[PDB]
Amino acid sequence: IRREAAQMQVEYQETQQAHTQAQLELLQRKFTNKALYSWMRGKLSAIYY
Amino acid sequence: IRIQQRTVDEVDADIAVLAESRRSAQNRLEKYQQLYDEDINHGEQRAMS
Questions:
Q1: Chain breaks in chain A (C to N over 2.5 A) after
Q2: Do B13 and A1 touch (CB under 8 A)?
């Protein structure tokens, strides 16, 4: 029974790893992602200059 | 919840281990009590006389 609980803990850790994968992917498919920010301040910096 | 449920089952199994331990201890209690009460049996008393 203790072995079963330890095995479930391994599955719990694997689930947490996949959760952070989804968080990072959602951050990249965001509308206000890194690419959008990079081009906006790039355009505005040239205008400001 | 599933992991914590297994923890409850583990201490239930530990109660079963304790029950088996008590069964052996009780048997020793009855065996030695019967020996103590009987003391010197008829064969031993016959030899002494």
A1: none
A2: yes
